[PDB]
Amino acid sequence: PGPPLFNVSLDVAPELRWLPVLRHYDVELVRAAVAQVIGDRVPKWVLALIEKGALKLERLLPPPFTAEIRGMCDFLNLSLADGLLVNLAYEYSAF
């Protein structure tokens, strides 16, 4: 039947437009899933420094790109550093 099919309205603010989708998912499954891939690849010394520069890093990235991640993180209780790392996985050779 293929994967789930979801609607995302680009007329809703970036922080809010992914949240109706996240309702259908176990919040703890997603958190643990992000935590596993990040912990398996990002060195612990990199994670420490990124968590301390996550707010400065967010401001230097495309606002709409980061605004959607910020909203999903608050909803999932995920750390911004974790949301940015997984969304910049391709741009980081660790992944």
Partner: protein, 230 residues
């Protein structure tokens, strides 16, 4: 990854891809097809993982389809400067921005070819008219090469794995040859989303790291089909 844009004997363009990455046990559960709406209407469709807002596979209905494959991503300090100092775009974010803003297959190739990026990538684009099929080998600053369909010359498909097409694939990881072999046997006459799907189901094109397979045709946007593998 493996992306294929091809044209059949009647002038129809088909576009399919295989997304290869570890952690399939996790990501298969989080794979989703997303229809992005404007004014309540489908502006474009994409396949992604819950939590990842960029699109590596997507379709602008009746305009073009696009997929992105990994290219040598260089060093992290080059990407850092390009990202934070030069303000270049993430790869999957440009791909999704193009699906949103580009008004035609031609405009999409321009955007995907010349917009500065944080790292290298292969952009594969298909359209809704004959010959509308290219592979954009991207540098950070622009296109290293553009590779078009040429049916009258005998080039009715373009097969991109993760290596430059003007060079031979590595002996250790060659999914290009079996993909070509499977396409020649299919034939430009019998090309379709189903036969295309079977090309992408051939080993090792279909390997243990394949998470999902998508086949699409911007001219028939309702045929957009993603399937979870394994």
């Amino acid at each position: 990854c493996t992306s294929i844009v091809a044209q059949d004997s009647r002038g129809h363009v088909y576009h399919g891809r295989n997304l290869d990455y570890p952690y399939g046990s996790i990501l298969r559960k989080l794979t989703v097809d997303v229809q992005f709406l404007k004014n309540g209407q489908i502006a474009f469709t994409g396949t992604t993982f819950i939590g990842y807002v960029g699109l590596w596979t997507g379709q602008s209905p009746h305009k073009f389809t696009v997929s992105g494959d990994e290219r040598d991503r260089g060093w992290w300090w080059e990407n850092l400067v390009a990202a934070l100092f030069l303000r270049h775009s993430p790869i999957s974010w440009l791909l999704r921005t193009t699906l949103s803003e580009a008004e035609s297959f031609e405009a999409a190739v321009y955007r995907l070819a010349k917009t500065p990026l944080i790292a290298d990538v292969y952009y594969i684009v298909g359209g809704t008219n004959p010959r509308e099929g290219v592979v954009i080998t991207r540098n950070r600053d622009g296109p290293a090469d553009i590779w078009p369909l040429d049916p009258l010359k005998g080039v009715w498909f373009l097969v991109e794995t993760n290596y430059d097409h003007w060079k031979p694939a590595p002996e250790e990881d060659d999914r290009r040859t079996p993909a070509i072999k499977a396409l020649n046997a299919t034939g430009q006459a019998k090309l379709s989303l189903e036969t295309l799907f079977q090309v992408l189901s051939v080993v090792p094109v279909y390997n243990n790291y394949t998470i999902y397979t998508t086949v699409m045709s911007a001219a028939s946007p309702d045929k957009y089909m993603t399937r979870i593998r394994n």
